[PDB]
């Protein structure tokens, strides 16, 4: 069960996203409501037990606040979400020369071509400019920036 | 929120029409104002209908009160320009049609389908689907 403090924090997030004054969040937004609570849910997590519709699709369903409370507790708060240790050894698959350096094109390609594929717009928004001559991107610096 | 800029702007608009008995806009004053305005919109019922929006005798103080509807939004010059700027990443050529249509229709204080038609009939656009924000800002206050 959640604490009173957790319930009110989840509510403070909820009262931003029911923006039309309805007391109800549109179902599409629930993934990003979870992101606003500091959990990092995959779109595969989001469409299953969290009950989300298609990606970027509005109108289909809405969620009351009390309905949202088990949809925080039993979902991303009931699973592994990955740590630093995951990302470092997943990136080391693409570390050809062992120096902590990956090409910016290769890192963009992993984000856009593999997994739950990223838009170029998403990739550029998160890029902190850390590209040298052909010294390329320190991938550990990218992971620490994305996990702060 | 009726600013000194706005009321002085309204004061000259009153004063150009004026010249009638000590500071009152009347029927004749409006009729001969139209003569220098290039358009024969001087039809008697319509002209005298514009008096019904005040209790009587349109002096300058009454003229400001008549414009009470106008102030009910009316965020100042560069604030509307700055508001639109947040939704442009690409720096003039401005807001992509799909994003703007979503922004008004399904985001914030939602536009009705009639409101969307009311705007698309007077919005500036290209042939691909982009919408000029600065030209919309100019249309709000008008200079052509």
Curated annotation (Swiss-Prot), chain A:
The keyword Cytoplasm appears for this protein? no
Phosphothreonine, modified sites: 26, 42
Q: Summarize the subunit comment.
A: Myosin is a hexamer of 2 heavy chains and 4 light chains. Does not bind calcium.
Protein modification? Isoform MLC3 is acetylated at position 2.
A GO molecular-function descriptor? calcium ion binding
Organism source for this protein?
A: Mus musculus (Mouse)
Task: Give an example GO cellular component term for this record.
Answer: myofibril
Q: Tell me, in a sentence or two, what this protein's role is.
A: Non-regulatory myosin light chain required for proper formation and/or maintenance of myofibers, and thus appropriate muscle function.
Q: Which residues of the full protein are shown?
A: 40 to 187 of 188
Full protein name? Myosin light chain 1/3, skeletal muscle isoform
Q: Which residues carry this modification: Phosphoserine?
A: 28, 54
Keywords of the record, alphabetical order, are: Acetylation, Methylation, Motor protein, Muscle protein, Myosin, Phosphoprotein, Repeat
- Where the record annotates domain EF-hand, the positions are 5-40, 82-117, 117-148
Question: Which GO biological-process labels does this protein carry?
Answer: muscle contraction
Curated annotation (Swiss-Prot), chain B:
Q: Which GO terms describe its biological process?
A: muscle contraction; skeletal muscle tissue development
What positions are modified (Phosphoserine)?
55
Keywords from UniProt, A to Z, are: Calcium, Metal-binding, Methylation, Motor protein, Muscle protein, Myosin, Phosphoprotein, Repeat
Task: Cite the InterPro entries for this sequence.
Answer: EF-hand-dom_pair, EF_Hand_1_Ca_BS, EF_hand_dom, Myosin_RLC
Question: Known PROSITE patterns for this protein?
Answer: EF_HAND_1, EF_HAND_2
Task: Locate the residues binding Ca(2+).
Answer: 18, 20, 22, 29
Point out residues bearing the modification Phosphothreonine. 5, 15, 81
Record GO cellular component, one term: myosin complex
Tell me the ranges covered by the EF-hand domain, including all copies: 5-40, 75-110, 111-144
Q: Give the disruption phenotype, in one or two sentences.
A: Deficient mice completely lack skeletal muscle and die immediately after birth because of respiratory failure.
The record's Pfam families line, in alphabetical order, gives: EF-hand_6
SMART domains hit by this protein: EFh
One Gene Ontology molecular-function label: structural constituent of muscle
Keyword Metal-binding listed? The answer is yes
The role this protein plays is: Myosin regulatory subunit that plays an essential role to maintain muscle integrity during early development. Plays a role in regulation of muscle contraction.
Other information: This chain binds calcium.
Q: How does it assemble?
A: Myosin is a hexamer of 2 heavy chains and 4 light chains.
State the PANTHER family in the record: MYOSIN REGULATORY LIGHT CHAIN 2 (PTHR23049)
Q: What is this protein called?
A: Myosin regulatory light chain 11
Q: Which organism is it from?
A: Mus musculus (Mouse)
User: Gene name on record?
Assistant: Myl11
């Amino acid at each position: 069960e959640f604490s009173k403090e957790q319930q009110e924090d989840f509510k403070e997030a909820f009262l931003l996203f029911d923006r039309t004054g309805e007391c109800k969040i549109t179902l599409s937004q629930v993934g990003d409501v979870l992101r606003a609570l500091g959990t990092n849910p995959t779109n595969a997590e989001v469409k299953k037990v969290l009950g989300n519709p298609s990606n970027e699709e509005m109108n289909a369903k809405k969620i009351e606040f009390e309905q949202f409370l088990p949809m925080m507790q039993a979902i991303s708060n009931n699973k592994d979400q990955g740590g630093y240790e995951d990302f470092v050894e997943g990136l080391r698959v693409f570390d050809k020369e062992g120096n902590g350096t990956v090409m910016g094109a290769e890192l963009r390609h992993v984000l856009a071509t593999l997994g739950e594929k990223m838009k170029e717009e998403e990739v550029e928004a998160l890029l902190a400019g850390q590209e040298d001559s052909n010294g390329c991107i320190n991938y550990e610096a990218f992971v620490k920036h994305i996990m702060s | 929120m009726f600013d000194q800029t706005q009321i002085q702007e309204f004061k000259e608009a009153f004063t150009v029409i004026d010249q009638n008995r000590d500071g009152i806009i009347d029927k004749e004053d409006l009729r001969d104002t139209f003569a220098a305005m290039g358009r024969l919109n001087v039809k008697n019922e319509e002209l005298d209908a514009m008096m019904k929006e005040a209790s009587g005798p349109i002096n300058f103080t009454v003229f400001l009160t008549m414009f009470g509807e106008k102030l009910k939004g009316a965020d100042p010059e560069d604030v509307i320009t700055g508001a639109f700027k947040v939704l442009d990443p690409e720096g003039k050529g401005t807001i992509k049609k799909q994003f703007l249509e979503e922004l008004l229709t399904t985001q914030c204080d939602r536009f009705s389908q009639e409101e969307i038609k009311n705007m698309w009939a007077a919005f500036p656009p290209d042939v691909g689907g982009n919408v000029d924000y600065k030209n919309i800002c100019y249309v709000i206050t008008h200079g052509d």
